[PDB]
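Here we describe the complex-level prediction in full. Unlike the single-chain runs in Section 2.1, the two entities below were treated as one system.
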Amino acid sequence: EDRFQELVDSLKPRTAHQYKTYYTKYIQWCQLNQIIPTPEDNSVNSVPYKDLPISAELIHWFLLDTLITDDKPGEKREETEDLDEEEENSFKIATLKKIIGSLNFLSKLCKVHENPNANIDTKYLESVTKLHTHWIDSQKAITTNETNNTNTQVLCPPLLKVSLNLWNPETNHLSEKFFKTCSEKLRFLVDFQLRSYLNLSFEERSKIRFGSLKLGKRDRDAIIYHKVTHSAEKKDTPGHHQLLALLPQDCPFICPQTTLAAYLYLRFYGIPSVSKGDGFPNLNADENGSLLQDIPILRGKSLTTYPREETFSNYYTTVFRYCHLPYKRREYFNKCNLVYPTWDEDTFRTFFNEENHGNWLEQPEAFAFPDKIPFDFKKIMNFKSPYTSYSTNAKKDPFPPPKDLLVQIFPEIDEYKRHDYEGLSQNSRDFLDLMEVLRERFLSNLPWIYKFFPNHDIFQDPIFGNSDFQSYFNDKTIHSKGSPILSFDILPGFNKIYKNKTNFYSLLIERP
Amino acid sequence: SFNPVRFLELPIDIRKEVYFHLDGNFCGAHPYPIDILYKSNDVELPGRSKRSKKLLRYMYPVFATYLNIFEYSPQLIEKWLEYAFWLRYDCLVLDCFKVNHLYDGTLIDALEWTYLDNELRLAYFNKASMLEVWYTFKEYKKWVIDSVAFDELDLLNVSNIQFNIDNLTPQLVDKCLSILEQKDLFATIGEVQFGQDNQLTSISVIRTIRSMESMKSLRKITVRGEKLYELLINFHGFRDNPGKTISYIVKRRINEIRLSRMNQISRTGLADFTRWDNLQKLVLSRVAYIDLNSIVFPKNFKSLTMKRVSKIKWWNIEENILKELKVDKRTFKSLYIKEDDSKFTKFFNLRHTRIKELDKSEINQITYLRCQAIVWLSFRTLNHIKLQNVSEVFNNIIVPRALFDSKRVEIYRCEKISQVLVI
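The structure predicted for the assembly as a whole is:
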């Protein structure tokens, strides 16, 4: 009781009762989920401070399930008016800062009551606060168009501008020699969508391999880039894992999975007459780290190498003068201060081991943490809304792709599925089902690529002009030739400006 | 069964000494004070009838601004809402406000303007920041003020109501000041507070300051933050700021400046009150570190009270005394200290500090008056000091004889303070 005098003096009485209200909500959430067991029912439960499980991930998962996974299964539909929703998510970010401060105070209260569990690791929650602050600032940037004289960049983001400019099969104004082939433009778009959607740097983009991308056993939509560091990047104690994810967008021209599958198709095959790819690999004697972890996800001068840096710097310069973007140093070379969290060994092994935490009524890996991934980083860095959190936002699929077009592209994976799927190593069949998911995404988002960019080098082969191809093309574009507005969404703020076809076609310089 | 009439028949000194210890807590649905809720190996947690649903649906959204803080254990709220109908009409409560206003704001502190139930009514908050009593100004003038102000016009005027922003939202600050503008009630308020939990002030603070000249009965200004102390009530070297500052005509009006909770007042080189040339008192309420060699202390102020501080430097009077009688500090402490405890030193206890004093026999009555002139040169005409809860004064504490007598200095919570020598 030595430190209780300067603990009450750290706060007002009003702020102390607000904080006790907020961690009373937290302990109610922990008792209804049985993280801490209740002593008895139909009695006043008096849990101690000595044994209260508090950590960064528990506080953040409370923040998920109460504050930012706004389900409300009878009253979700009161988010229509923009000013009311602006006041409401200003209230959300205010209560976010207040609950983070209250649970930080609860940690400071429990550490003096002999509880060795409550270490907050506050840079994690500061990254979460800065993430939600940046999302509220993006909503502020759209709702206030009188900020500066850069209103064209207020309407169109650099991401959509550079992405939509890099779907163009002709480069009469982009680059004469630098962006000749469509495969080089698709690997530049893969580099741009692994740099912008995933805040890494140049050498960590060089670390991307074939077998590093795992698969979602729960949701299947996320590209599970488990950045495994074997005790050497700056530090020992081998658990330093940064988990990354890529989800299918609403706009097909910003989806990274179809782009990745298109470039891996143009690397496995290429063009049968002009630009031949690298050829299909062995995938039969693949030891875990022998053939998949040596061939990069994008090629260069040699067949099995990573290219030169100033070539990509000049590519960035030519694209950003084509897209009218003043280039800086913080956004595309160095690491930002708004990134994915890296997990230390104890909290990465302990918190997700379900059999050691079997007393819980609902494990976090099942619903809120999709395969060891934070939810809000996932659905903010994909530019989505994390508020519905259990809806069918990603399950939008009218006119589903047939089964005859599955076997016509990538037949080797069908050959391996009719081969022994189990007898190979784990990364081999993991890469096989990975390319199956990527092929499904490519067959999904292919008719928009054919409709809005028909000059692309995929269709420089007379086997693709069959009846089923154009039949699925017409069956997907049957709801796009008679409507003045687009049927597919773009960005959660930008669905009331670029929903019309005129504003979307006006971003394209060559052949709108 | 408590009897109100038998209580209200006994005279007014006993009723003062009842309502002085009943701090402001008129209700039985008081929250637990925040000393047992932390000193516990337990967390009181919730776990709802036919009548309480009606109260939490109909009464509660009127009071959802100031009472949503107490959502932990909502038995407190469904005990509160049966007091909330009748407690403001109670005869004990109104008698407490009568003997408050008849003793000039001493008993229970600082009725507050607020805007709830669309009226701009007064409010009383206890120390746990809970409203208990809310009166509109017609009812407050009718049945408590006019029940004690029969015919003398020096007591009809009610000018002790605080204003207290950070209680309420800045839109409600704007609406409260607009309704206070359309009436002639700026002379009603008596003091303002400041919140905001380089020169970037909040909207409510600017709205409060831009109508602060209109009071003409304002004293007792106070702030609550170190990132707001430097912006309007410290001098800071700024000599020309037309907007956003605090309007030099109204710097003359105030009587004291309360400094609620901070870390240091001398974050810059000097924490100077060169302006506020008319304040008499100053109370440092929970500031962590203060340096008495870093305050400039205006031309005629009287009281420097201070409480709950963590470190005091001192006016370093000893370093100027040792230049005068020309000794070393060890020789001074060994030879020229008498530690006299005749009878007035033993009147107020101070059982933890040891009160010391210079020698009447080893100093020759002049260089004794010079040693006292050092102390009165370093104080510059203050009298009341009142050291409450403190810890670890750096320099030794030196207090003059004329001010240590008559109980004008008063160390109250003597735990880590020690060895106050009196010269």
